[PDB]
């Protein structure tokens, strides 16, 4: 059994180190990797370390541990919520902008504390750990979890034992995402995680020696999946003590806050060396205390945070666009885009808000649909730089005809993109209504629906904009300046 598990990880390492198979064969590669991962996992014991009892029983010790090291423990409590898991509930009234949470650096798990832990020797020898603080944090977490005397034991014992990152999805749950934008990042996550587990399994088991490292006795695929999901769903960038650079960190107590829409109200206080959080809004006693995680898309929330957020006002989808070298106006268009600080081709974002395109995308699309005479006006003479200056401003168009052309293109390309999906918007909504699905399956289906709904909104915006400028073209309205 011990050599057999080593042979399997060596095959897993080879498979997951191979170049990308091509987009048409990524699903096949994914199922091949799952098969090998699943065979390793059935031959292993699960998590190397587990803890008795229910998750609620450990939160009192987390609070006592935080209070004895200077953290705030007044005004809130840990409660199991129906829609978010566990989180903070105010035990008193909390007014907006009130400082209610602070966590000194001594409580944090950071790349620096990892370097100074039992992981230190391996970290100093391994070029991957030195390059990837997120992976180092994951191993920091595993090493301390396996250390009964660890200072961070009260925090590690309150972490979830399972997550809703795609690493935990069944194959048929990932299958819902076929033909979506998001599934490629799911494939990458799965292949990254498997390559890393196999790489470090061979480093730990094979490479001298039998260090004080607790991972030498037991390092399972379950261990690594749990550790990277803990880090990716909870990690944070903070300054170092010197304030000279940034590091990755796990922030106990405060990272139990669940997410809602709003603005970031959590910041690092370097002089007093502690994390600080002020109330996003008024929280009456008994209400859940929320924070704003960040302006991430639902693809990012699903893949890296393990949840889908309804009414995420920052949801977006990628759109790839570029001036082809086949265009006879390529040189002029590329020069205009260069002067505006835009590459000749890039990945842009379509947003589910109004307007759905950014200033950068609007500037690119304007150049994309520009005549040669219009491009010359953006290249030559005393007004050329000023015309570039307003290229991304919806109030100052190049011409009525230019607006109609660019909005026609966006309408057409978004409509084309809707037709590359396996299901329609209406069929997804009927799957979600008429069927009873797992939480993870609903996440996959709502994500593929969300992509199409964002494209659908772009079609409607572009159609309206098209008609607006086209009717103003017919009336020959004076162009603004």
């Amino acid at each position: 059994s011990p050599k057999e598990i080593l042979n399997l990880t060596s095959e897993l390492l080879q498979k997951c180190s191979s170049p990308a198979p091509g987009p048409g064969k990524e699903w096949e590669e994914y199922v091949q990797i799952r098969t090998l991962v699943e065979k390793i996992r059935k031959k292993q014991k699960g998590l190397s370390v587990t803890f008795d009892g229910k998750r609620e029983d450990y939160f009192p010790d987390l609070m006592k541990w935080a209070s004895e090291n200077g953290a705030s423990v007044e005004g809130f409590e840990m409660v199991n919520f129906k829609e978010e898991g566990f989180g903070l509930r105010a035990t008193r009234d909390i007014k907006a902008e009130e400082l209610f949470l602070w966590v000194p650096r001594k409580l944090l798990m950071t790349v620096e504390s990892a370097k100074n832990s039992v992981l230190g020797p391996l970290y100093s020898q391994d070029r991957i750990l030195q390059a990837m603080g997120n992976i180092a944090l994951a191993f920091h977490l595993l090493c301390e979890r396996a250390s009964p005397n660890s200072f961070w034991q009260p925090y590690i014992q309150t972490l979830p034992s399972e997550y809703d990152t795609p690493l935990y999805f069944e194959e048929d749950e990932v299958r819902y995402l076929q033909s979506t934008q998001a599934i490629h990042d799911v494939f990458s996550q799965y292949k990254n995680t498997a390559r890393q587990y196999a790489y470090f399994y061979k480093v730990i088991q094979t490479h001298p020696h039998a260090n004080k490292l607790p991972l030498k006795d037991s390092f399972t695929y379950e261990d690594y999946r749990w550790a990277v999901s803990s880090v990716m769903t909870r990690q944070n960038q903070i300054p170092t003590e010197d304030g000279s650079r940034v590091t990755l960190a796990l922030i106990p107590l405060w990272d139990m806050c669940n997410h809602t829409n709003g603005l970031i109200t959590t910041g690092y206080n370097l002089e007093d060396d502690r994390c600080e959080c002020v109330a996003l809004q008024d929280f009456r006693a008994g209400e859940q205390i929320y924070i704003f995680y960040g302006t991430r898309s639902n693809a990012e929330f699903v893949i890296h945070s393990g949840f889908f957020f309804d009414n995420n006002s920052h949801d977006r989808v990628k759109i790839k666009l570029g001036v082809s070298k086949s265009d006879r106006l390529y040189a002029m268009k590329a020069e205009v885009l260069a002067r505006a600080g835009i590459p000749t081709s890039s990945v842009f974002a379509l947003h589910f808000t109004e307007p759905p395109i950014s200033a950068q995308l609007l500037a690119f699309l304007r150049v994309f649909c520009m005549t040669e005479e219009e491009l010359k006006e953006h290249l030559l003479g005393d007004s050329a730089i000023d015309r570039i200056f307003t290229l991304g401003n919806s109030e100052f168009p190049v011409s009525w005809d230019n607006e109609v052309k660019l909005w026609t293109f966006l309408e057409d390309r978004a409509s084309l993109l809707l037709k590359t999906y396996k299901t329609t918007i209406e069929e997804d909504k009927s799957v979600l209504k008429n069927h009873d699905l797992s939480v993870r399956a609903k996440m996959a289906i709502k994500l593929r629906l969300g992509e199409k709904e964002i494209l659908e909104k772009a079609v409607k915006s572009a159609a309206v904009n098209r008609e607006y400028y086209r009717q103003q073209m017919e009336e020959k309205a004076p162009l603004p300046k």
Binding site: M132, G133, N134, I135, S188, Q189, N192, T193, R195, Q196, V228, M232, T233, R234, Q235, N236, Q237, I238, P239, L248, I251, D255, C257, H259, I264, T266, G267, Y268, N269, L270, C275, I291, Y293, G294, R296, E300, H304, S305
Partner: peptide, 15 residues
């Protein structure tokens, strides 16, 4: 804005 804003679960490259 905050000098050192903290983003819960900030996204990082894992390759």
């Amino acid at each position: 804005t905050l000098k050192y804003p903290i983003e819960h679960g900030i996204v990082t490259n894992w390759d």
